[PDB]
Amino acid sequence: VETPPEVVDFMVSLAEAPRGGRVLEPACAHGPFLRAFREAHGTAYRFVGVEIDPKALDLPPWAEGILADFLLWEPGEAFDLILGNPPYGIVGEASKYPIHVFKAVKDLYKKAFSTWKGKYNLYGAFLEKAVRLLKPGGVLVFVVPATWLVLEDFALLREFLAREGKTSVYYLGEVFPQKKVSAVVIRFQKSGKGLSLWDTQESESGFTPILWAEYPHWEGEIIRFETEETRKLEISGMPLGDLFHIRFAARSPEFKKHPAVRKEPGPGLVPVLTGRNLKPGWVDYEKNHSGLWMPKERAKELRDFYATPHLVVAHTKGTRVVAAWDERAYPWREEFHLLPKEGVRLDPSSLVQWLNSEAMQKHVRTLYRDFVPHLTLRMLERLPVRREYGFHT
DNA sequence: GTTCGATGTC
DNA sequence: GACATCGAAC
Ligand SMILES: NCCSC[C@H]1O[C@@H](n2cnc3c(N)ncnc32)[C@H](O)[C@@H]1O
Fold first, then answer.
1. Residues of A321-330 as b/e, b for ≥16 C-beta within 10 angstroms?
2. Are residues A194 and A98 part of one domain?
3. Domain count, chain A
4. What residue is closest to C9 (Cα–C1')?
5. Core-most of A133, A163, A196, A211, by most CB within 10 Å?
């Protein structure tokens, strides 16, 4: 893993430390951020790098190198500036997740980090740890995935940043060659409050920040790229989540162990549907993408709502809104399943048309860009629906 | 119950 | 780029 030099340069441009200040690069390897900071600001700082792998630690003699797990490291003194690119990844079983440690080590991380939630991620733990290691008024500059802007797993992290200091977020996007990740830079200072959101433009000269919006009273809410138009559309109708209960499909292991489920087609059996069966405005009931089949009538044993025709919205087609009415009421292995709340009247056909409309695709692309390869529940529940498509009694 | 991906594989 | 994970995680 390397950080492109124009990304390093941009981050160094955002970094500051007082003369003689302590400057730290977590997960440093050969210390590219220490080196770049020194080149730009000179030698009158105490440079420290922390690296877990002895094969990777390779700092110049002007820096102190410590062999340690940064996440469990307890230095004698706090830092003025912490900068770098922390490891990204979920800690879990190797068949499914990339970061592999003893359960005991994962337990130490959970104990250490107040922001740890759900499956979480090393990059969230690195951010929390770094903030904890800052002196009052100290500065952190990290490049990390954009996913914490919007995802529930990072709610405690966002709330923590919001209360611990002031935050600037600079959208970069997919700037790591051969890595599929949309990135942001966070500049956090352990004083003051509020959020500033910035776009960037890349030129030969490097990255230039462009101020997008300011939220001086940010308390850790989801971060979005709002515009006059997104606001105007959001007040035009009721949030979709006010009209529907939003549920998810039963998961693959639930179907795989169910006695009614088969691995081959046969009389009275239908495919268990996936996102590949869902298209804008229609459902493919014939093709099998899950490897699983079952009697339609037994689908309700997995989720009661599989018995009832209802609206289905895609989760893993990227940041877009893809919807269809499941008229037949089939078993699904994937996607959101929307059930009208009490007193809600709908025009399924018109609502589906609206959800699939170009206006709606632009809306979610503006707000959430490419932070995650999904439409998530928190995005979906806020989609505006005017009373002509769906209206609450 | 439902979340997430330095995504996985074409 | 198309077209989406799918199951261990809680
Ligand atoms: N800063 C470059 C991306 S992160 C990759 C580097 O972080 C190191 N690393 C991974 N986990 C670490 C941890 N918990 N503490 C310190 N270094 C770590 C790796 O050994 C590798 O050199």
1. bbbbbbeebb
2. yes
3. 2
4. A119
5. A133
